[PDB]
Amino acid sequence: YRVVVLSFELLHAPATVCGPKKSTNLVKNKCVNFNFNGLTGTGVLTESNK
Amino acid sequence: LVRDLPQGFSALEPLVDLPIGINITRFQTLLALHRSYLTPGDSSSGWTA
């Protein structure tokens, strides 16, 4: 049946291999709160700037 | 520049973290020896550093 099995060694779980992934448009200039990925903080909307 | 190492204005960068589950107490580096093509009459082996 063409079996395929992954490994997931888990000995280095705290790494940069996470892949949750999402997308939603952001519009600034309003009283909003939001948080994605993670840094423990809230900011203002709209993607990309400087 | 005039200084070979004691100065410089930059920022060092980490690249990739790696686990190694074994005790480490001694280290040694390598060196590459270039093969030198000698004449048949030499009948010897030499390397260029």
From residue A19, alpha-carbon distances to A22, A47, B17, B24, B35 in Å are 9, 20, 18, 33, 48
Whether the CB of B19 is below 8 Å from some CB of chain A: the reply is: yes
Whether the CB of B22 is below 8 Å from some CB of chain A: the reply is: no
Q: Mind telling me how many Å the CA of A46 is from chain B's nearest CA?
A: 30
* Contact indicator for A45, A28 with CB cutoff of 8 Å: yes
CA–CA dist A36, A27 (Å, integer):
15
Query: B47 forms bridges with which residues in the sheet?
Result: B35
Method underlying the structure: cryo-EM
Contact list in B for residue A10 (CB cut-off 8 A) is: none
Query: A26 forms bridges with which residues in the sheet?
Result: none
Contact list in B for residue A11 (CB cut-off 8 A) is: 19, 21
